[PDB]
From a paper:
The guanylate-binding proteins (GBPs) play critical roles in cell-autonomous immunity against a diverse range of bacterial, viral, and protozoan pathogens. GBP1 contains an N-terminal large GTPase (LG) domain and a C-terminal helical region, which can be further divided into a middle domain (MD) that contains the α7-α11 helices and a GTPase effector domain (GED) that consists of the α12-α13 helices. The GED folds back and interacts with LG and MD, which is important to maintain GBP1 at the resting state. Recent studies have discovered that IpaH9.8 ubiquitinates and degrades a subset of GBPs, which is important for S. flexneri to suppress host defense and replicate in the cells.
We subsequently crystallized the LG-MD region of GBP1 (GBP1LG-MD) in complex with IpaH9.8LRR and determined the structure at 3.6 Å. In the complex structure, it engages GBP1LG using the concave surface of the solenoid. On the other hand, these regions are involved in forming the dimer interface in the LG dimer structure, and therefore binding of IpaH9.8 would lead to the disruption of the GBP1LG dimer. In our structure, since the GED domain is not present, the MD domain is free to adopt a relaxed conformation. The α7 helix, which is forced to bend in the apo structure due to the interaction between the GED and the LG-MD domains, springs back to the straightened state. Starting from a highly conserved Gln321, the C-terminal half of the α7 helix rotates ~13°, and this conformational change is transmitted toward the rest of the protein, causing an ~20° en bloc rotation of the α8-α11 helices. In contrast, the GBP1LG-MD structure likely reflects GBP1 at its most relaxed state.
Author numbering:
A (entry chain B): 22 to 177, 183 to 240
B (entry chain A): 5 to 62, 73 to 156, 167 to 185, 198 to 243, 259 to 479
Amino acid sequence: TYADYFSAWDKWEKQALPGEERDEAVSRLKECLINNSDELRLDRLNLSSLPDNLPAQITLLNVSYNQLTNLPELPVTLKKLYSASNKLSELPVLPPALESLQVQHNELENLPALPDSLLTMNISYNEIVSLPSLPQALKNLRATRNFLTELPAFSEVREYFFDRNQISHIPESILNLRNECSIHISDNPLSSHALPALQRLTSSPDYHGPRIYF
Amino acid sequence: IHMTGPMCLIENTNGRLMANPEALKILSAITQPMVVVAIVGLYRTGKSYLMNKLAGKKSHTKGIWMWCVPHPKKPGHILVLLDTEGLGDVEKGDNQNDSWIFALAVLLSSTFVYNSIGTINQQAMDQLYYVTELTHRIRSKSDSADFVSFFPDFVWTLRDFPDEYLTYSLKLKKGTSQKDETFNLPRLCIRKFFPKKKCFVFDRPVHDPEFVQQVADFCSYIFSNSKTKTLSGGIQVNGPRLESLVLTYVNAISSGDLPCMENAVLALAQIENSAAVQKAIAHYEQQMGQKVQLPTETLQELLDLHRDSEREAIEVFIRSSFKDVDHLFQKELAAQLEKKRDDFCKQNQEASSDRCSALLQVIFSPLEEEVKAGIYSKPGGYRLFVQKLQDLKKKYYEEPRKGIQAEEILQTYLKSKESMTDAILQTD
């Protein structure tokens, strides 16, 4: 319903910490849910958590810059998730219509499913070891500081850079992409043979491969 | 100088750090020494109020904005108001360069000012990841040691709630585990890197008394104890130098290498000395532009004018140049003057030949016509030929400044024009 949303929101208000702006958060929640607002932003509230019931129609959630630990179940209608610079440990399942996942400076350990509608995505400044197959149209990816071991496979305009990781390996799946990809993989302890293998490979008719910055 | 609205100095769009040339023009014009103060902070800590009440007044482009206004408590000096607008707006734009904007606000300013809203809890420290990368983002000698040499004085500002808090608030705890090891890196840098430190507080302006005066104390502090932006032992930064530094740092970021402090000074010296040459050259074409009128009487005169003007223009080089290490510019100036000399000498010889041949024609062509007709083949014309030729040569040399190559060409006339006198004497 609607009046039932106010119940759990007024119940979170009590279960908070001293320096945790919860009255402003509840005010913003009621400001969004009543005006049928698509956007909802809880910018800088020192929140240790979020309520269990977000509005069931928003298309933009900005809960960045907090002390969160785990997000509630995001509504299906969501299309942009801006949740960075807090202390997340795992991401609840992404809505199927998601188009932008902005989560950095957290402590993520692994990423769940990624729908085919992810255009941009930033997972930098975290602790990821493996990634699922990047969707068909994932344009920009930033994993600039993680613990990755192997570069992920793309399911074929593209521009992902995996700066500062412990990957150090390039298979065929990279050299099968045309001259539109851009894979900056600098600051990586790459293989001693693969280090100049790219040099003598790129100094060839490599117009059926990708740009590789290192 | 006079600006009414702060404009963009470095915009952060399309995943690239670019300078604004129109705003660099305004820098290259202000020739007065500068006191640079930045206002770094998150994207909506009310960043503007510390600029309007600092310059003295009353949906944008993100990056570093500047505001130049005359110094209200100093003569000649001009304070610069930098401000990181849109810092951390994860929603609006790219955040590859927030660390870069932080590093540049450090390198350009003379009193770094952070602006947080919280209470310096662990959250306000986790929102300050920019400082843990300064040792990975800024070189200083073509090591993280000589940072206190040029790093600014920290002035923290808590916009909702003084130095008693900060003096012990950064007291890192002792240990060796990885959990406490990360807790050191922010506080270790804010203390060791910055020479002078401070802190401020501001009550809320809603629901003023102890705010307008509260911020007046902080504004008076910044007005009073701010110091001029120095590089390496003096050299008060002043417009053009700030532009050179901005261009050097940005063209280092958007090129790959790290923003160096030594190279950004060496290039500034080699461009502020690359003007000393083109200043001493203009003082050479000007002085030796009306002191020499070719042809000259002798050669020692021209060499005496050179040896004077050369070491007179070398003075102009010394008066507006510094750090010509290995003396590389004070010889490309000299080798550019000795060529001017060696060219002036040949030019003078040619200009002597010109006037000599012209006077030859002008004066002797009447005689050429006279003997060409035959007015001298008469039985008695040899003596009058001698008269006219001798007196005409007498009227040749009484003509000032014929050049050093004076009569050397004149003998080519007489020696190759003696058969006329021969036939005339035979026809006497």
